[PDB]
Design a protein around this ligand. Sequence first.
Ligand SMILES: [Cl-]
Length: 183
Amino acid sequence: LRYLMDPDTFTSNFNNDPLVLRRRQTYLCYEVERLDNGTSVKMDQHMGFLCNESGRHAELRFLDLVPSLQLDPAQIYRVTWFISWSPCFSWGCAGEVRAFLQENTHVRLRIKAARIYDDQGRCQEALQMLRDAGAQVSIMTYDEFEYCWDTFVYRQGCPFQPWDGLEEHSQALSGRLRAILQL
Ligand SMILES: [Cl-]
């Protein structure tokens, strides 16, 4: 988490109010944990946040920087995404992440999303495609919002202050997502 996110930037885009639908940007905070001897090893050079740049969505910009992580293909790494939009909202995004998981079987992808975009169409199919490729997808609760504020945000020792309806929004979003991925 070398460079920290602007705090006002964090609250705007990670707000989970269903009645607000901003298409401004999509932020992805990432951390890679190596799972070894009953613990999780985390390196600061494997942490940070991305957004959409050029015509490359944040989920695909993280896949690009995977070789520069110098991961060991003989060990188990768990990658976590804290993402401010529905996972793989862009076209063809779920297919690349699916292919990536098939090649790098030493990687476990865990996706914590501030919200989802239930279109009952292709965005809903993208969420199920990630599940079937092995990804573990769930809605961010107060825990995840507070953790990112402490971990990725330039807070200057200030505590996380939740916005109105954070828990109500999260549980309703959680209920819809669970119904989508239920089997
Ligand atoms: Cl969930």
